[PDB]
């Protein structure tokens, strides 16, 4: 019920903390954007390490005519650490078989192992984490189980490749899972746990997407100028911050990403933040918890986080049907859009929430669709049109 939504005044994305106004793109790039990035690094997602000077990886597998002659398939292992039994991740890549040149790639963070992304028997079954917080090999019945969320046939049809990484290889997603992930790798000598401004798990997943990018820009069959990033749900939060931190993504797609993602926090009284920091204490850094239930007012809201993409592409999307707030995510994008105008680009183009199946916008796009929390065939149809507008 929209009459029950509190009203509020958003922090001004185009004013500095002093109150001085941001007057042009120069001033955004040199003054305001660094200040917004610093705010979110300290109070929300946490400080991450710098880019590793050298990527340690191995191309484990390269096959032709995969997917019924439709694709070239690779599988690449990226090591976060020389040690043994150390954290590492398996990047799956499908490039179109007919590719005459290095091809654009959509990179994605996946909720399942690489065997869930297509119905491809050449792909080894991956060990996944379960409802009981155990890790164990996946059953063959699970192959292609996420296939409808990735629609690889449409992507190749459009002339593009798809790259995916299973996110829990970077850090498993349950409270207590940090010890199995990359964050312990960067502790100071005799450091037991993260300081309250250090990266949390969302930040860790984002940092992994950027190491996937490190590899994509070495692969001669990939157009390193034409990579984008997609994430769903909690991984849409990750994708927002990876986009903020990593200028190489020409666009990000953030599908139904909620609180700490695209959604405007001030549309409730801090209860989503508490629920998240309570149930998922690993997601955000220790400073974020002071904002629970408005015990402190946030010196930010989500339109500022989304503006960290400007002037690159941004697609926000929602589903009609729950525990989500689609209009909150629309208003995230619409209130970030002024920043794209500083650069001569077009944003959402409206402040009125559209109806079902009516995509709006140019460099910032939005749609709401029927159905449940998911990624569907309808979504990818609009995403691949976005991608064409973004890539030429």
Residue numbers in the entry: 25 to 345, 347 to 417
What does the publication say?
Glucuronoyl esterases (GEs) from carbohydrate esterase family 15 (CE15) have been suggested to play key roles in reducing lignocellulose recalcitrance by cleaving covalent ester bonds found between lignin and glucuronoxylan. The enzymes are α/β-hydrolases with a catalytic triad typical of esterases. The targets, exhibiting sequence identities as low as 25%, were biochemically characterized using a range of model substrates, and the three-dimensional structures were solved for two of the enzymes. The structural determinations of OtCE15A and SuCE15C reveal similar overall folds to previously determined CE15 structures, with closest structural similarity to the recently released bacterial structure of MZ0003.
